[PDB]
Symmetry: C2
């Protein structure tokens, strides 16, 4: 191989217990989440990984995960860049609700379509809703028309990949060692891209929280292989938790 | 006023107990240091401070302090920029030694000159020494000739101010709310600049660890006033601790 890229999904948040749709809601890591980040950092150290540049989203839980990892590596001084383009998928008007409140409000049929679809977004937020991204000043540098009121996975993939093209790939091609600390659906977008997954396969992909995913890439950034770091049992446990 | 700039010095490191000269040595914060950062963040939150951009050094202890502060503010997503120009003063061949080892090795006279001088650096590191910055890959983007083998305070000031000019001041002038999390001597450089301190006064300036220092600035970035945040007693205790080191 020529290059290594490391991807990591943040751990449990304060809303995973009640199983709320999170999306762009800026919720904090839980203490379990914090501990998962510590272990992901210890794992990277044990395996000899170090980095020159780090990327994350504009959401706290990803950034806190990244900071904990870099601290464990003794690399809290490296260049860090953040972008909305690595944000979790926007879940529209589902944000803040549990699955049963969602069924009750939008109906069993529409909820079944939304869960199984690649390209049908859930009900959108109105711009007047307090949850809408336009009301958060961290997004004021982004034209309002491009801030999502909702996303299907297809929308998420379409706004992730340009960041891969313009920033992440650029750094890899300059020989920098990159880590990306992001979210389930934004990492799904990247895995779909690298391994040319079908819509069906990306919808069933369950990326384990807190386990580094390493891609080995050739001179042209085609994947040679990938693998999660650490023991098969830790990975299985984390993968079942994401499924269930 | 027109603008507010916030400066903060990191808290205790793992070498402050034994009182070792640290400089560019990349030592970690102690648990007391971590706690000082937590309190500095809680203090800023209590007082309604928020930020658009943050600056720090290339040293872990400053960056860890900054990350802790931003986490307490719920602002771990903001833009952060790091530069060697905000590094602590380089202490040359004193790095890793205590005061008595330094006296014994270099003598009482030279140690007295070094402590009182603005412009006489301590004994320099050879490029072959393991402590020399050229051996650390975090500095590989900097021409070797500009990486210090030692610094006097005058050298430190001379390499801090350009970062103020090119980056920090630029952001302040664009209306961004800036925080700088750095070190004793790099902040001394900035205080010397803002308040036009004499060489004597900057040498006696004790910036307390972990207490935010706020400058109110006019349209042209001239200081109107400054103040530390929080209770007089926390400040006094922190200032006496710095006098002690």
């Amino acid at each position: 191989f020529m290059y290594k890229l490391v991807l990591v999904r943040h751990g449990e948040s304060e809303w995973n217990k009640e199983n709320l749709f999170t999306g762009w809601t800026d919720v904090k890591l839980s203490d379990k989440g914090i501990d998962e980040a510590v272990e992901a950092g210890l794992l990277l150290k044990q395996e000899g990984y170090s980095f020159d540049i780090a990327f994350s989203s504009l959401l706290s839980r990803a950034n806190d995960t990244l900071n904990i990892i870099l601290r464990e590596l003794g690399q809290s001084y490296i260049s860090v860049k953040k972008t909305w383009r690595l944000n979790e998928r926007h879940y529209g008007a589902l944000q803040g609700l549990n699955k049963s409140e969602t069924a009750a409000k939008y109906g069993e049929d529409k909820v079944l379509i939304w869960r199984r679809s690649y390209d049908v977004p859930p009900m959108s937020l109105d711009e007047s809703d307090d949850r809408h991204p336009i009301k958060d000043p961290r997004y004021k540098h982004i034209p309002k028309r491009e801030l999502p009121s909702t996303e299907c996975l297809k929308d998420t993939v379409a706004r992730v990949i340009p960041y891969w093209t313009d920033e992440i790939a650029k750094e890899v091609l300059e020989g920098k060692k990159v880590i990306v600390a992001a979210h389930g659906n934004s990492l799904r977008a990247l895995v779909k891209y690298f391994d040319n997954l079908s819509e069906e396969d990306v919808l069933k992909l369950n990326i384990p929280t807190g386990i580094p995913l390493v891609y080995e890439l050739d001179k042209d950034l085609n994947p040679i292989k990938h693998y999660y770091l650490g023991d098969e049992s830790k990975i299985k446990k984390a993968m079942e938790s994401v499924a269930s």
